[PDB]
């Protein structure tokens, strides 16, 4: 809507916003994240991961 500048998820986090310079709408998505996991056999057997 013309008045609405921000947008929030169900869990109250921002998911959309309106550019001030140009009246457009953008979907904001957080940058990728992940849990790095290392798969390795016993160090006595080998040192490959």
């Amino acid at each position: 809507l013309p008045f609405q500048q921000f947008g929030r998820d169900i869990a109250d986090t921002t998911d959309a916003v309106r550019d001030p310079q140009t009246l457009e709408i953008l979907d904001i998505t957080p940058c990728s994240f992940g849990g790095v996991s290392v798969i390795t056999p016993g160090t006595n057997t080998s040192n490959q991961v």
């Binding site: 998820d9 986090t13 957080p30 994240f33 992940g34 849990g35």
Partner: protein, 49 residues
């Protein structure tokens, strides 16, 4: 988005279905013998008897 991750199950739904099918076929064709040892065939009317 805030650092909470869900991990996928190790065994997919299809593998669970396959396990249930294996148990079901075993109980249809072998009665209770396959649970306590090697699978021995038995006609279903005799198992019901």
């Amino acid at each position: 988005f805030n650092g909470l991750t869900v991990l996928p199950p190790l065994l997919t739904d299809e593998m669970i279905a396959q396990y249930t099918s294996a148990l079901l076929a075993g109980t249809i064709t072998s009665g209770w013998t396959f649970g306590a040892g090697p699978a021995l065939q038995i006609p279903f009317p005799m198992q019901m008897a």
